[PDB]
Nucleic acid binder design. Sequence first.
DNA 1: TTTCGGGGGGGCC
DNA 2: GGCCCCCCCGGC
Lengths: 352, 258, 257, 332, 51, 330
Amino acid sequence: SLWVDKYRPKSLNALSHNEELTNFLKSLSDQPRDLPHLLLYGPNGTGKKTRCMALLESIFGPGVYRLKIDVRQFVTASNRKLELNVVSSPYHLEITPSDMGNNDRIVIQELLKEVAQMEQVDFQDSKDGLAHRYKCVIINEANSLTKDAQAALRRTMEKYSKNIRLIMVCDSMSPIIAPIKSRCLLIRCPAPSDSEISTILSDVVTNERIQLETKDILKRIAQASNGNLRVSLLMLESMALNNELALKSSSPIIKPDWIIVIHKLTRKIVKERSVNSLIECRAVLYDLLAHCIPANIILKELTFSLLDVETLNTTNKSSIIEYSSVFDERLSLGNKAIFHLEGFIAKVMCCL
Amino acid sequence: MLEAKFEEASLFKRIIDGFKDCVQLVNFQCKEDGIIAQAVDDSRVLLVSLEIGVEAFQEYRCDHPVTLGMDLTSLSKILRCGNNTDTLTLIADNTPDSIILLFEDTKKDRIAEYSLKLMDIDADFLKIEELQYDSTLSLPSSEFSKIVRDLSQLSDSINIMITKETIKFVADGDIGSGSVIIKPFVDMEHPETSIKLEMDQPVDLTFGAKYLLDIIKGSSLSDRVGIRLSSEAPALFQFDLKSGFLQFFLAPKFNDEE
Amino acid sequence: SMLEAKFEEASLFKRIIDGFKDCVQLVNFQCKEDGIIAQAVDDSRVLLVSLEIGVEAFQEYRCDHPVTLGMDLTSLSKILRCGNNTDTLTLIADNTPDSIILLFEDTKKDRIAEYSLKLMDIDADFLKIEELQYDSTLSLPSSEFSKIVRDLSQLSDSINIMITKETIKFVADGDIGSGSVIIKPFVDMEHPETSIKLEMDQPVDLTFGAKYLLDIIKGSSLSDRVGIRLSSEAPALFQFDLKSGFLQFFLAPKFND
Amino acid sequence: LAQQPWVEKYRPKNLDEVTAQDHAVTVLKKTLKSANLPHMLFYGPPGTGKTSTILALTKELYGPDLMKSRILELNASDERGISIVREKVKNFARLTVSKPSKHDLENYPCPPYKIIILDEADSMTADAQSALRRTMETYSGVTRFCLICNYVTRIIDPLASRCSKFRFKALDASNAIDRLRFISEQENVKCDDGVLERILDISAGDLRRGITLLQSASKGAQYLGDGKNITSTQVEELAGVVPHDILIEIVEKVKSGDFDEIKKYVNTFMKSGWSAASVVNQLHEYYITNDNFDTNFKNQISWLLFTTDSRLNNGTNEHIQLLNLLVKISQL
Amino acid sequence: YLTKEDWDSIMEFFVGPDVTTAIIKKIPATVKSGFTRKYNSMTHPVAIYRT
Amino acid sequence: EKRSKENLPWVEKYRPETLDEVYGQNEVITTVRKFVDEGKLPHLLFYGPPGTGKTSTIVALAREIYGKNYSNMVLELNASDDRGIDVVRNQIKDFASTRQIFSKGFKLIILDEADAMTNAAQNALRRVIERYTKNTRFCVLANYAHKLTPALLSRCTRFRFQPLPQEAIERRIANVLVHEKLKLSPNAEKALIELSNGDMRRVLNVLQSCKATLDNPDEDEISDDVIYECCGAPRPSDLKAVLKSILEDDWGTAHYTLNKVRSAKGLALIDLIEGIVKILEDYELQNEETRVHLLTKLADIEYSISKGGNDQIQGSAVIGAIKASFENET
DNA sequence: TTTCGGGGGGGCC
DNA sequence: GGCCCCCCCGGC
Ligand SMILES: Nc1ncnc2c1ncn2[C@@H]1O[C@H](COP(=O)(O)OP(=O)(O)OP(O)(O)=S)[C@@H](O)[C@H]1O
Ligand SMILES: Nc1ncnc2c1ncn2[C@@H]1O[C@H](COP(=O)(O)OP(=O)(O)OP(O)(O)=S)[C@@H](O)[C@H]1O
Ligand SMILES: Nc1nc2c(ncn2[C@@H]2O[C@H](COP(=O)(O)OP(=O)(O)O)[C@@H](O)[C@H]2O)c(=O)[nH]1
Ligand SMILES: [Mg+2]
Ligand SMILES: [Mg+2]
């Protein structure tokens, strides 16, 4: 088991950063019978899902962590068969409807309504045998849901609130439509500070007995993660493995392959500006997209790497950021991402 | 080390067929007493309980209780190739990755021996502690099948109103409503189709039509089905076996207008 | 209740409804103190069905004031299929009803099945299109008419009926060929049930669609004889008499051109 | 009850509990006596009390018992394709109204028609909407239609023509303070002066959001166990409003005009999780209502803010949009 | 709860300087054969039943 | 229906029953009346915008030709009924090729809202129309002419239903007031006509809402104020004040004036934008780029408003766009 | 490749 | 004869 998962806290008392959010969650869990629907938003890797699980464990018993995966079948209007992998616990349920793309709507109309419109048999911690509690459903990547899928949630939340409570988790709130944001309690989850990341990494190292020349190592790893705790833990594990469980002052910071590819693409764009260069850039973009690298991630990293070049002037950076904004909007409204990425690269080449 | 020689394998076929739709992965505990099983539905709204006593089997023995997580679909596949009137046995070994199903017959030629793989399913300590159910009745399985297949066309929700000396069925839908009132019934010349009832406090419970249809799919086991209704607890439908029974605890549809 | 009408055997009403359920979609019953009269028009406005079940067909029939009931034959057939073919059927309605109650009762046991069918706001008149003086009126066994229609419809989608002095001709002209059947009036004192009668005033020649005749012939299961009345410039009448009422199909002929 | 969120627990039970929609509730109440209710099209921003208003009208028209036989409610959670519109809605509209009881006629007005409520009608396709045009008119004597939407432009012109339009106004501190104060008093929430006004201003027309914020503040105060009045600072913190210190830092960095410093500050700022919409709104408030800037600067910044808000409304990356907006403002 | 097929699939994702195709091919045949024998000589858990 | 006609909405209560009760379409009504009075009835097509009287006119014409029993002598189909290829090939063909059941006469088929029909059905209708013209006549009703195939249009005689004139609307309002025992002020009528946009449905709905608004309709008079509160529309004075402040005051004063005007009665920004556009389209701008910028920016703002967004930012954008566009006047 | 809706043409029954 | 299923276009 990786260190990132082997030391994840399992209770609200085990959280070790953003104590204000911990106190707010404790206040919410103090009287959970009237808990409204929740929407947790914040940067990636901060610990939103961990906090959601801790809140559920505070509301219900420790038994929320006994998860089991099952398969649910769905039929479309064309008779096409679809399968959804649902993670469930004796107290809560989890769904990721975006896994079915435009078909996610069916979930909101078939699965969720099935959970909320019927009572559930509870033969544990109960005397009659029927659950005397509401069911908590967790929708992950809620920002990836289609607009109609989100619209299908409105009356479901407003009618069966006595039996179903929804805890949605998202990285950005802009894709969420206004009615859904109005129907939920919004919880901001700030990213951990560098000191807290360093403390967590120090605790992990001490538990794993990884030799450290100086603590400043953990500082640099914290800075390279840009506030992402999961990335910090995985990077620490990778460096420890590559340095025989011993980190020295000269230990390099390991970056993932796709970041290196994007940086090489940025260097190539800066060096050469022509149509042949654009053809090779198209080849690189196809290679990146064929390996499950999202287009929006590619655009963001490419834009920031270009803006972090010590050879361009203010006008070039302004043009680059403007084009990045325009083509990010284009990507949000389009289907073929390669077209928009190529257009952005061509515009950047023209401006430079 | 364990065998369950059956009087007729068709009984086991029907037993497995009676709850295949509700659940597919169910833990079966085999003890010298017999076969037991309790599986919660994937939606956590229905529970399938099963038990076959030692009496029903032609010859049942076991040296050490053993829990098998064998799949129901695989067992159905194994049985369907079998003959009509045989004496299925469930032999295995100390560390069984599979269970040999001996489809033995009185004749030495009509044999359909097979093998069924076993799955490592997880079992919990489910408790079905008896409750003071307010009402309990028993009526012929054919009548229930007809009533359900009739009312399912007119609606998707079926209300089972058990009041004083009344077994009222209700099904309201878009086209209209359907009600088939049954009353305590006894026939001296054929008491096998006598409606039995015992009722303390009135019980109102509305269930889903699909669940009731799936439950009655397995009503061929017993010519009579027993409905136990409690206001604050999940009502249960029971079909008697040769030496046990198959019970289904179906949760009631939630009431939002109230 | 306002209206209470008991059928001794539910098969009677099921058969009556089965006679015209394949040609109309929405039916309008209008019950009075002299029985139940119902009308139904087809989607193409080419065929009309009129039923006049009398009070003598019920074990008991009580109706205080005339009551209108708009229903869909599909739902009515669906529910009637629910009831068994050995139980008494009570039709029950109240003042200005919102639903019609079908009550199946089995005297063998204590089982009572009540079905409420929601009514429709069908507002229409009958117009009693029964043109006084027709040009020709023939009567013949329903079996022969059904056989002729089934045989000729296989040739063409249109069938022409000609009525001349002591001659009735059915003609079909299709693609593979043509077929003509000629029948003249005759009487058999030994078995009058098979006789053919014709009363003629002026020659008639009218064309009809084969689909509508194929639908109409389904009523032969209710009566052993059929009466066909034809007149130029008027729809053709196909009457099947019942125990106390009758079933009439008014079919509009095709334009000649 | 005590087991329900405050938003649902304080849902207007009758038409007299609707706070700031009298211009339409008056005619709706008049219909209770006139019994000539027209086809209705409710439209407005979120959380203005449209579903509550229609439900209360149904309460006051038919009563608790006759309701279910006189109401057909379909929302976005229900399939509403052209086939559904042409079969189920048509069949329900063609039926005769259910028979009222003697009690119903003795107590409730019981108009001689049923009601079909197509909630969230803006999610219906154009063909499905067109399928309703003649159904609405032909059976107007036995059925009435209520189309509830957020974007009136998504309703086809014929349907809007057939329906009497009712606009639900935004709920602010001047027309919704009484209801929020009543909720706080019933729930015994002790707040400082101006806290409810601040909540309503932050809500920006959404009373549901205001009630949820009040509930969150009440829960925080109860868990604190200090017996102290809730302050506006805590309300702002729970609403995700950026502190004024961060805003003045941002405007100072923009005034500096250096691209690299602005980029670094935005990178650090985005790690706190602040929503870009709130940042843009607060920047608009700070800039447009400041006398230190000239007319041309405001003219340009208004269009820049409008463009950024429109782009953000399409679910775009917040980091890039915020950086672009800040750079463009710095170059004004 | 990873299988050999999952192992290959994971190894087939990396791009750029972390492509494992050449390295995987360079692995000794005996090592891979022993790995397969060890994997098939034991009983492994299942994350999802009846996938 | 249920109960008397007094339970119906005014849009349906005042539906024309005869052909002399249709107003604002004198030419079309006269032409169709002459056609029906001489047996010269061709395949008709009624193209027009919503709420102009096409359905009322065709139903009245059918009643005139046949009588009270027109519903039993015509084949009326609309968007609520399936009209696929099979329907055209079977039901319409049977109706057109067969004599009347009830009483003699020709056959009338009214395909209301035919613009919703598919191309295949319209193509199949061609020979059906052309072959049974001896005994059948087809009437088509449409709001969008681009959805109809060229051949079907070629086979039909077109009649355009113009937006309702002012005089016709006033006459209908007079009839409604007389029947309802209502009093309407001249300015109230002016506002009603202005907001109607040539649709009688809007007029009737707003008048019914105004009647409901009055506390004692028996002797109370409907004034322009009643219309403004009922519809929630901005007053002309409010729009004029907002435009004046935007055009000859600083940003702070303009923002304050807009906010105060909108918060006085909870007015919507879209109605204000429409009002300002109507006011400005009568201005005599020296420079064309001023009008170009105004139109483009206001259209962009309207499109953005159509999808939600931030209301305050949108209002500030309106103010800034107007100021920038008018700066070009010099 | 590809998100509904309509039409055709074949396969169970 | 009727469902049920699969495949294929869609501007002018
Ligand atoms: N006029 C109002 N008076 C009192 N409470 C209101 C009012 N409007 C909204 N609320 C409150 O906010 C909650 C939600 O109101 P809703 O009726 O759901 O608003 P809505 O406009 O129908 O929502 P949308 O447009 O579908 S997002 C109510 O339960 C009330 O608690
Ligand atoms: N010329 C008119 N004269 C009097 N009333 C009219 C007139 N036109 C429309 N109306 C009124 O508005 C109501 C609807 O008229 P319609 O005949 O349905 O208009 P329409 O043009 O056919 O609607 P569309 O194009 O299908 S949206 C009628 O009941 C009348 O009360
Ligand atoms: N020691 C410690 N680790 C945390 C905490 N919160 C999150 N983490 C770690 O950070 C990892 C990522 O957290 P996660 O919730 O999955 O990120 P998110 O879902 O994208 O918000 C997890 O594997 C945790 O181990 C915390 O409060 N204390
Ligand atoms: Mg709503
Ligand atoms: Mg019309």
